[PDB]
Amino acid sequence: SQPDPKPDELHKSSKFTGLMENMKVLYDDNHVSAINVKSIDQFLYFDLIYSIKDTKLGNYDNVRVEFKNKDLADKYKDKYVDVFGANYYYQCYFSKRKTCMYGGVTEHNGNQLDKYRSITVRVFEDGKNLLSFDVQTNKKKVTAQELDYLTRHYLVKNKKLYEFNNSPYETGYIKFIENENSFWYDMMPAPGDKFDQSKYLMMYNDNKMVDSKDVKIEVYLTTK
């Protein structure tokens, strides 16, 4: 289990002077999504390269999925898997049209549910749970990344979580509770002049999974 964030631990959006669009866009309508596919190349020893066409916009024919370590790369190489990720293009390199992501991989066989499951998200604004809603998945074991993405996607459309210039919210974190054990991610960008998509998204490289049946999601936002 992970300790809840100490006061000044959380990133303050007022201390970020770049364009929030560069965070917003990671959680827009688009994302990497593939069903039942096998790695077809590898660049470095901790990544795998999948052949996935961006049918929608033509932005990529292949996808580099990057992991925290060799073991995760080894584990899923040769496996038939489902991919779901928030992807980046700017400082994305690997040896056509390309994109890059971290983690976001689950075994295909035996992970498919017959019906979609609902997971409740409770959104606290300055400590008041004034909005709740459900995200949905059809995977038994789902990555935190996918759930995070689905959650922020909604919140962008419906609460302007991220805008072009900045955000109405000063701080924000997303908490994943699974029984007793729990963890969280900082939803705001590191402080400074520019936002580093690659670095931010790297947090997903642990490929952390949760159980769709018994996970709950809490999101804590504070205003300025």
């Binding site: 669009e21 560069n22 072009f164």
Partner: protein, 114 residues
């Protein structure tokens, strides 16, 4: 040969109107694109840049503008609530490890309301 097509070439709008200028690469797949505006027969001033897809970078003169790079070929400039003061000629450019390719320019006139 690599080129850049802005759209439209000439536009008139009312104060308060949402205006969108388009810029599309043809025969290229370049990472860098640029939106400038030119003041009155003088220097180009950079509003926004983009180092690639899903990247926008502030320029010298970004206030009151937004921009958007949803794919390599396309870099759009967004005026959310147009101001007369944004009356100008605007120039798009793409760029590629050596050269720059410029659009023909968009003359935008933003008039006052009733």
């Amino acid at each position: 040969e690599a080129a850049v097509t802005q759209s439209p070439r000439n536009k008139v709008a009312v104060t308060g109107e949402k205006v969108t200028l388009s810029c599309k690469q043809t025969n290229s797949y370049f990472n860098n694109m640029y939106w400038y505006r030119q003041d009155t027969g003088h220097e180009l001033r950079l509003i926004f840049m983009s180092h690639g897809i899903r990247n926008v970078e502030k320029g010298d003169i970004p206030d009151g503008y937004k921009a958007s790079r949803p794919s390599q070929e396309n870099f759009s400039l967004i005026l959310e609530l147009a101001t007369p003061s944004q009356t100008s000629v605007y120039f798009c450019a793409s760029g590629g490890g050596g050269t720059l390719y410029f659009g023909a320019g968009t003359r935008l006139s933003v008039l006052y309301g009733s």
